[PDB]
Nucleic acid binder design. Structure first.
Ligand SMILES: COc1ccc(C[C@H]2NC[C@H](O)[C@H]2OC(C)=O)cc1
Ligand SMILES: [K+]
Ligand SMILES: [K+]
Ligand SMILES: [K+]
Ligand SMILES: [K+]
Ligand SMILES: [K+]
Ligand SMILES: [K+]
Ligand SMILES: [Mg+2]
Ligand SMILES: [Mg+2]
Ligand SMILES: [Mg+2]
Ligand SMILES: [Mg+2]
Ligand SMILES: [Mg+2]
Ligand SMILES: [Mg+2]
Ligand SMILES: [Mg+2]
Ligand SMILES: [Mg+2]
Ligand SMILES: [Mg+2]
Ligand SMILES: [Mg+2]
Ligand SMILES: [Mg+2]
Ligand SMILES: [Mg+2]
Ligand SMILES: [Mg+2]
Ligand SMILES: [Mg+2]
Ligand SMILES: [Mg+2]
Ligand SMILES: [Mg+2]
Ligand SMILES: [Mg+2]
Ligand SMILES: [Mg+2]
Ligand SMILES: [Mg+2]
Ligand SMILES: [Mg+2]
Ligand SMILES: [Mg+2]
Ligand SMILES: [Mg+2]
Ligand SMILES: [Mg+2]
Ligand SMILES: [Mg+2]
Ligand SMILES: [Mg+2]
Ligand SMILES: [Mg+2]
Ligand SMILES: [Mg+2]
Ligand SMILES: [Mg+2]
Ligand SMILES: [Mg+2]
Ligand SMILES: [Mg+2]
Ligand SMILES: [Mg+2]
Ligand SMILES: [Mg+2]
Ligand SMILES: [Mg+2]
Ligand SMILES: [Mg+2]
Ligand SMILES: [Mg+2]
Ligand SMILES: [Mg+2]
Ligand SMILES: [Mg+2]
Ligand SMILES: [Mg+2]
Ligand SMILES: [Mg+2]
Ligand SMILES: [Mg+2]
Ligand SMILES: [Mg+2]
Ligand SMILES: [Mg+2]
Ligand SMILES: [Mg+2]
Ligand SMILES: [Mg+2]
Ligand SMILES: [Mg+2]
Ligand SMILES: [Mg+2]
Ligand SMILES: [Mg+2]
Ligand SMILES: [Mg+2]
Ligand SMILES: [Mg+2]
Ligand SMILES: [Mg+2]
Ligand SMILES: [Mg+2]
Ligand SMILES: [Mg+2]
Ligand SMILES: [Mg+2]
Ligand SMILES: [Mg+2]
Ligand SMILES: [Mg+2]
Ligand SMILES: [Mg+2]
Ligand SMILES: [Mg+2]
Ligand SMILES: [Mg+2]
Ligand SMILES: [Mg+2]
Ligand SMILES: [Mg+2]
Ligand SMILES: [Mg+2]
Ligand SMILES: [Mg+2]
Ligand SMILES: [Mg+2]
Ligand SMILES: [Mg+2]
Ligand SMILES: [Mg+2]
Ligand SMILES: [Mg+2]
Ligand SMILES: [Mg+2]
Ligand SMILES: [Mg+2]
Ligand SMILES: [Mg+2]
Ligand SMILES: [Mg+2]
Ligand SMILES: [Mg+2]
Ligand SMILES: [Mg+2]
Ligand SMILES: [Mg+2]
Ligand SMILES: [Mg+2]
Ligand SMILES: [Mg+2]
Lengths: 402, 140
RNA sequence: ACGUCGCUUUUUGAUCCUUCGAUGUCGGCUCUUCCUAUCAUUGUGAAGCAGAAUUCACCAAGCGUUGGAUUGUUCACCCACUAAUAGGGAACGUGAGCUGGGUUUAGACCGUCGUGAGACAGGUUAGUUUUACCCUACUGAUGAUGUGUUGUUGCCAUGGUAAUCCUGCUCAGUACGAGAGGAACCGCAGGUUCAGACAUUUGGUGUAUGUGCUUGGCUGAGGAGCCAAUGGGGCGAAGCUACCAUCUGUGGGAUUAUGACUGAACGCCUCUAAGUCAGAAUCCCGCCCAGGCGGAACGAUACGGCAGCGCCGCGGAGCCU
RNA sequence: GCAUGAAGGAUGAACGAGAUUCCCACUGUCCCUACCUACUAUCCAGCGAAACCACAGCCAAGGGAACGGGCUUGGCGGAA
RNA sequence: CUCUGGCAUGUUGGAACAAUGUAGGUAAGGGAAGUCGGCAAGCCGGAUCCGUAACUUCGGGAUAAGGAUUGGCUCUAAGG
RNA sequence: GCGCUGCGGGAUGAACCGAACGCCGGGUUAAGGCGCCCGAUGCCGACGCUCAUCAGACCCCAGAAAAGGUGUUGGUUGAUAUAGACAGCAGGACGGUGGCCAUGGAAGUCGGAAUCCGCUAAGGAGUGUGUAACAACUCACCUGCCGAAUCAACUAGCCCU
RNA sequence: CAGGGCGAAGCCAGAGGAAACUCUGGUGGAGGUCCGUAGCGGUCCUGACGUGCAAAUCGGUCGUCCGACCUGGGUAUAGG
């Protein structure tokens, strides 16, 4: 008989199976559609989730109760040191899909990128690309590479650059670089190859891929939770306390007929560590990395036009379980998938941004830098000393010194 | 936006944590002679299976007077929550909460049955109901 | 209306074919899926449709259909909210899922009946709810399986699929209407219900057994500690986590109903016959999740042993299959 | 008054692990679920049963003793 | 909790800290809206001083209900 | 007849259709079939009927009725027509009389019965709209333009609702 | 068969009264008395277990706990 009262189903069947992701790095399942009219440009970038703080900004939203009023908005800090282009890959449109036509790598490959090719770098001889690189010097190789570039020019319709992160600039134990293919949109295919050939072995900053006030998508692997019951995995109603045999369950996993458990019924298993693609994450700030100017170190990337404090995006005491953000970063509104230190794929929007929220221009007024390793009380090292004054350790240090 | 009548505001109330589910007995903060309001239903709630309708400041509810003047008892009144003890986040990041849960008896037009309000009235409630804000002593 | 033709198995009967070396009985609860004879929501046609509201009908099951008082209740009835609070199936779906209120063993009470033992679709009270480690199904987990080995980067066959409804503002107190009343599209700000995250912030947790306080005892005492199955309590990092905080949720195509164009059949007419157009919460795809006993491109390919290997010389024979 | 009623009728203070209704206080009973601890479960070394068992084990429809794992016609089927 | 006396954790040990359990605990705001039913849990709790209703077989009800106080230290007075 | 019975066909099936059975070869059939599964039409098969945005498709047998269609195909009974039909484009549609009764109103047109006559090409005791009644429009009937077939009812095949 | 609560009769003193008697304080220590151990029992979680530690057990919570109390041994009653 019919269920007495109507109720929505628990969970979405569009995210099945709820299995551990086959990949750790976020995968761009679809790149933005190519408009040859647009200038040649990359469509994606790789970043690392450092942590989250909150900001203060004035909202220009006519007709809203927060119009010309200041609000506090949580933001996520994604460390994005420049990526190095080490290869070009061409694709041909076939009646069976897109087929990898030809791959051409640059002459010089860093040990960061070369680590990606080895399960045990320590025990290896690091021979990868040692014979390939000679093609760029030998006369026979130079002609062969030029044949590849011309064939890619003549037959490929999709051109992508193979780029890798610089793990040496990040405060992580990992030194193996995450490599990914980034599609090159805009222009003709000939212009795509000319543009990509120049960028070979070069660095690409994040501000050449993304801009301020841009709605972008974040692709990555959610935080793993291990083996979970239906109550946590699918958020099914807990059974009464009197329930024998346990209550963190689903009572009826199906009718008598059909005589099989259906795929739509909530079951226990893996939760988290699922590949996901969240969209419309607005870029609030593209921060600059630490810079050395005429002898001194410039690190006031957390200063706004209204808070001229010389402080970095790093909270007092550093980002918890991540480290110190010294490279370029992107400040994204709201939260994103993944743990701290998780590599995130930043992709341009597949949609046309015309809503007022998407077209909003963000002007920051304050960036919170209080410690997140407890109840943060002071924005900077300086004002903590100014407020508290000298301590016992300070007296002893000045006593020992003089 | 549960409020359903002409005379509303271009700006719309943002979502607030609701701490007062049906069954909540809240104080009556006006001079009608009622001492408390017993919620029986929140206006605008569609809800789901098993979820008790719940209200926050600014929410019109239907309530019965459990103790107070006898002619106010044994009948259903439209009431508006003006104070709640559940802390709720404003858009400027302030987690505000009051000492008590309080309401005032009104009619369907939003006009207030009493004449004075004891204690402060939340800013969210005051903006949504002009008549209540008019009788308020302080707006928190 | 008088008549009359049907459909359904959501009632009850009729029957007794299956089950008595046993298919666990009512109801609820939980959960999934399905049907449409559509309550709402999308697109429409008709009115005794001025507007608003309402009624009838079509495409239509994508999505939603709630919180309680009494009752074991299915069913009822009322309170209240709502866009609406539609109707049904799945062994009267769902007891090694639960619960056990009812029914339906043994105790007992009352009324009626009986000489009695006892009986009672009359009422009442108390009354053990067993087993999965097997196969499959399902959920996750490893692995097998192309390509010599191995790795990196990818493609997409196919399977899944998701968003929903409301309110206020503007339009506008306008069209319409004598008046009362009273719309709509575009635009704007939000919210419900769902989905997928996340922990900066607020809240929850807390055996960092972190740091104070404290009872009884114990180490002669101070100091430092310990025991009391976490002694108790305050505050509490990290981590986890809550519409109890916060973020994000999307574009095409052919078309249905219908309304039409050109236009015969039928010198007229006609949306249809040939031809053509507009067209929607449906459908299909995209986005998104997985990734074939399915492919692709690219890298490196085994040494002091005289070893392992590749390629050529359509080099020489012979072998097994 | 279906079918109350007098050795049992009617009533009782006190008592009750007796049946019922309401109110206060109280709470995770619930909204709505989260986290923590112990012991398991989990993996390992040693040790090591039982129930049960025609043969077995993927479905849809069909027909059939009128609800099939096997039969028919399709969907399909890949070690451990 | 300790001494005398006794014992080696109740027929095993190691590693880990998933789900579901069994046992214990806490939970914002609400407060029985859960459920057949407040089942379970929670609230209360000792002592001192106050204050104690209906009813009653005058014995009770009664720790009714309700309220305050409570440590440490230094003293004062009293009771042989 | 099944039970007691296999075998060919009916996909499948106790009963249906053919046919009943020692172990085989050749030949031929029955019922039933011959696009492919799957033996056989791989015939230059014959004559039609039918288009389905739920087509239809073989005894038992495994889905449907009343009712309807200006789909189409036949067939039946009438009617008009080269003295001019049907369609279309235009004019007349008159007098008695506002026929009788009835009705407050009833003048063709609320109702019941009569439903006749000079006047022509025709005009009614009216097929409808319309009015309190009128009026008015309009229909049959008939004429101008036109130049070959056309109109009405019914019936039953497939298809559709 | 811990430790506590309530405080029957009897008794003492004081006060009032013409008397009958009354009032107040104390003493006393009764009861199939109350709270609650050991013991005895077995309410509820319809908790654990439910091929169990166990062919009825375990945990929390409970009933009673000077009496119609609990209990050893001896003895009597024997299948319609
Ligand atoms: C009146 O309601 C009921 C009457 C009988 C039964 C049991 C029977 N049903 C089918 C079987 O014959 C038998 O199942 C068993 C296990 O004995 C159940 C409910
Ligand atoms: K049901
Ligand atoms: K509701
Ligand atoms: K039976
Ligand atoms: K502590
Ligand atoms: K009792
Ligand atoms: K209750
Ligand atoms: Mg339903
Ligand atoms: Mg793709
Ligand atoms: Mg139970
Ligand atoms: Mg922190
Ligand atoms: Mg419920
Ligand atoms: Mg503040
Ligand atoms: Mg009838
Ligand atoms: Mg039967
Ligand atoms: Mg059985
Ligand atoms: Mg059986
Ligand atoms: Mg069974
Ligand atoms: Mg129920
Ligand atoms: Mg329909
Ligand atoms: Mg559906
Ligand atoms: Mg009930
Ligand atoms: Mg059933
Ligand atoms: Mg059942
Ligand atoms: Mg059972
Ligand atoms: Mg079952
Ligand atoms: Mg029972
Ligand atoms: Mg009985
Ligand atoms: Mg009985
Ligand atoms: Mg009976
Ligand atoms: Mg009973
Ligand atoms: Mg009992
Ligand atoms: Mg199990
Ligand atoms: Mg196991
Ligand atoms: Mg915390
Ligand atoms: Mg000390
Ligand atoms: Mg010790
Ligand atoms: Mg705390
Ligand atoms: Mg939330
Ligand atoms: Mg279209
Ligand atoms: Mg036309
Ligand atoms: Mg059409
Ligand atoms: Mg079109
Ligand atoms: Mg009698
Ligand atoms: Mg009697
Ligand atoms: Mg008596
Ligand atoms: Mg089947
Ligand atoms: Mg059946
Ligand atoms: Mg079987
Ligand atoms: Mg067979
Ligand atoms: Mg132990
Ligand atoms: Mg041991
Ligand atoms: Mg032992
Ligand atoms: Mg705590
Ligand atoms: Mg709480
Ligand atoms: Mg609280
Ligand atoms: Mg309360
Ligand atoms: Mg209830
Ligand atoms: Mg209920
Ligand atoms: Mg209890
Ligand atoms: Mg009492
Ligand atoms: Mg026989
Ligand atoms: Mg015979
Ligand atoms: Mg035969
Ligand atoms: Mg046969
Ligand atoms: Mg057949
Ligand atoms: Mg032969
Ligand atoms: Mg034949
Ligand atoms: Mg055949
Ligand atoms: Mg053949
Ligand atoms: Mg016909
Ligand atoms: Mg048909
Ligand atoms: Mg003693
Ligand atoms: Mg005494
Ligand atoms: Mg006693
Ligand atoms: Mg006692
Ligand atoms: Mg005992
Ligand atoms: Mg039990
Ligand atoms: Mg068990
Ligand atoms: Mg004895
Ligand atoms: Mg004795
Ligand atoms: Mg005998």
């Amino acid at each position: 008989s019919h269920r007495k009262f109507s109720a929505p189903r628990h969970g979405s069947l569009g995210f099945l199976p709820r299995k551990r992701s086959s990949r750790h790095r976020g995968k761009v399942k679809s790149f933005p559609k190519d408009d040859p009219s647009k200038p040649v440009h990359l469509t994606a970038f790789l970043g690392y989730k450092a942590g989250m703080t909150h900001i203060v900004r004035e909202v220009d939203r006519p007709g809203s109760k927060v119009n010309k009023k200041e609000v506090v908005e949580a933001v996520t800090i994604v460390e994005t040191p420049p990526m190095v282009v080490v290869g070009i890959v061409g694709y041909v449109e076939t009646p069976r899909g897109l087929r990898t036509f030809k791959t051409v790598f640059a002459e010089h490959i860093s040990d960061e990128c070369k680590r990606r090719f080895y399960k045990n770098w320590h025990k290896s001889k690091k021979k990868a690309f040692t014979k390939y690189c000679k093609k760029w010097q030998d006369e026979d190789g130079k002609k062969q590479l030029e044949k590849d570039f011309s064939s890619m020019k003549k037959y490929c319709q999709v051109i992508r650059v193979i780029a890798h992160t610089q793990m040496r600039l990040l405060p992580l134990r990992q030194k193996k670089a995450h490599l990914m293919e980034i599609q090159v949109n805009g222009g003709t295919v000939a212009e795509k190859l000319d543009w990509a050939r120049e960028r070979l072995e070069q660095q690409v900053p994040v501000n050449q891929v993304f801009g301020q006030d841009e709605m972008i998508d974040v692709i990555g692997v959610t935080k793993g939770k291990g083996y979970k019951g239906v109550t946590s995995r699918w958020h099914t109603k807990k059974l009464p306390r009197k329930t024998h045999r346990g209550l963190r369950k689903v009572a009826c996993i199906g009718a008598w007929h059909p005589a099989r458990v259906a795929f739509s019924v909530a079951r226990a298993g893996q939760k988290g560590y699922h590949h996901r693609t969240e969209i419309n994450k607005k870029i609030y700030k593209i921060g600059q990395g630490y810079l050395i100017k005429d002898g001194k170190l410039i690190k006031n990337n957390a200063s706004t036009d209204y808070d001229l404090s010389d402080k970095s995006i790093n909270p007092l005491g550093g980002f918890v379980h991540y480290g110190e953000v010294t490279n370029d970063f992107v400040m994204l509104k709201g939260c994103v998938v993944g743990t701290k230190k998780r590599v995130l794929t930043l992709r341009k929007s597949l949609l046309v941004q015309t809503k007022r929220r998407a077209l909003e221009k963000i002007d920051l007024k304050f960036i919170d830098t209080t410690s997140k390793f407890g109840h943060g009380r002071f924005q900077t090292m300086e004002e903590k000393k100014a407020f508290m004054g000298p301590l016992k350790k300070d007296r002893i240090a000045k006593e020992e010194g003089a | 936006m549960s409020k359903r009548g002409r005379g509303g505001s271009s700006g719309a109330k943002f979502r607030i944590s609701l701490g007062l589910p049906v069954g909540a007995v809240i104080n009556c903060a006006d001079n009608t002679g009622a001492k408390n309001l017993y919620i029986i239903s929140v206006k605008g709630i569609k809800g789901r299976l098993n979820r008790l309708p719940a209200a926050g400041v600014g929410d019109m509810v239907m309530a019965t007077v459990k103790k107070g003047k006898p002619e106010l008892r044994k009948k259903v009144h439209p009431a508006v929550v003006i104070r709640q003890r559940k802390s709720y986040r404003r858009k400027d990041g302030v987690f505000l909460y009051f000492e008590d849960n309080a309401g005032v008896i009104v009619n369907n037009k939003g006009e207030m049955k009493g004449s004075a309000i004891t204690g402060p009235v939340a800013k969210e409630c005051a903006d949504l109901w002009p008549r209540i804000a008019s009788n308020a002593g302080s707006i928190a």
